[PDB]
Design a protein around this ligand. Structure first.
Ligand code: 6LY
Length: 330
């Protein structure tokens, strides 16, 4: 089997992407944030505290003939940005772009933190990291990808995120028309539950490539590109007026600036992030200070190849027995 679904930015900055997902029988369609940095499929639901729901579409398991309470199971998750959610668990039929999994754990939120409530466009998350990170207790549950894997034509999914435009998540096949050149594959460590890999270096604009190992995770659920302070300082030093602002919480730059591109290494290959991808616009409405799309990972404990990086590439998440990551230009 295979599946193919369009993923759409939630706003004009590409802060996140939502993908329609069918849950239950008859189908209830929710728009979920596919997150290669976590492993829970959770949704706003009929059980979510009413004051914490504001415009989201909810899953109502009592209206699904295939929903079953997973007795005794609870979940609770905290994300890198400080947001959180928790609740109980059903199993139900879940389909993405034509690919159906039966008995998928669908984690129903009883509580969500304010940042979820405040974002009307995201009805929940669909985790695509390794199932070892799933938070369901006392019986850990599998991700949608893990459940689908044996059925898939090939045990892979691909992320093809757009810049200020829709893109595609495919399951079970590699669309050879969706990228240019060849896909370069690189080793993955699953030891921490993430799609963790090592970039071979970087360049800023038309500068020389610096060969240096940068360990990081491929994370579709993180907006920005978080890299070591040395690398980030080298980048922003090429933008007149750029500075790290403790008040704003990172690098800002004059909105009048042109940004240089940023290149990262994948083995001997190179992925070029155009300068415009690194512009996240005014820090507040009407400001002439703009927020940078490349920020320091110092104090995160790991580097994060988030959407800013991933959307410059066609990315293969290969879940074969020995997982790997593939990157192509597009
Ligand atoms: N996208 C999931 C989010 O919780 C996350 C943020 C940062 C890191 Br490191 C891992 C995961």
């Amino acid at each position: 089997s295979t599946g193919s679904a369009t993923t759409t930015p939630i706003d004009s900055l590409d802060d996140a992407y939502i993908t329609p997902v069918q849950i239950g029988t008859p189908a209830q369609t929710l728009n979920l944030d596919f997150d290669t940095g976590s492993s829970d499929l959770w949704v706003f639901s009929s059980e979510t505290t009413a004051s914490e729901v504001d415009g989201q579409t909810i899953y109502t398991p009592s209206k699904s003939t295939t929903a079953k309470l997973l007795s005794g199971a609870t979940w609770s998750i905290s994300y890198g940005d400080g947001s959180s959610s928790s609740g109980d668990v059903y199993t139900d039929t879940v389909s993405v772009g034509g690919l159906t999994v039966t008995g998928q754990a669908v984690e129903s939120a009883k509580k969500v933190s304010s940042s979820f409530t405040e974002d009307s466009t995201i009805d929940g998350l669909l985790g695509l990291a390794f199932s070892t990170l799933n938070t369901v207790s006392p019986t850990q549950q599998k991700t949608f990808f893990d459940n689908a894997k044996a059925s898939l034509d090939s045990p892979v999914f691909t992320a093809d995120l757009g810049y200020h435009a829709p893109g595609t998540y495919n399951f079970g096949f590699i669309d050879t028309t969706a990228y240019t050149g060849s896909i370069t594959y690189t080793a993955v460590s699953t030891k921490q539950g993430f799609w963790e890999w090592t970039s071979t270096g970087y360049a800023v604009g038309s500068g020389t490539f610096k060969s240096t190992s940068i360990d990081g995770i491929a994370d579709t659920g993180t907006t920005l590109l978080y890299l070591p302070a040395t690398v980030v300082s080298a980048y922003w030093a090429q933008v007149s007026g750029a500075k790290s602002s403790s008040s704003v919480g990172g690098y800002v730059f004059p909105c009048s600036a042109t940004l240089p591109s940023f290149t990262f290494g994948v083995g001997s290959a190179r992925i070029v992030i155009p300068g415009d991808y690194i512009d996240f616009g005014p820090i507040s409405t009407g400001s002439s200070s703009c927020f940078g799309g490349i920020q320091s990972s110092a104090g995160i404990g790991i580097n994060i190849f988030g959407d800013v990086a991933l959307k410059a590439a066609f990315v293969v998440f290969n879940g074969a027995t020995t997982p790997t990551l593939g990157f192509a230009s597009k």
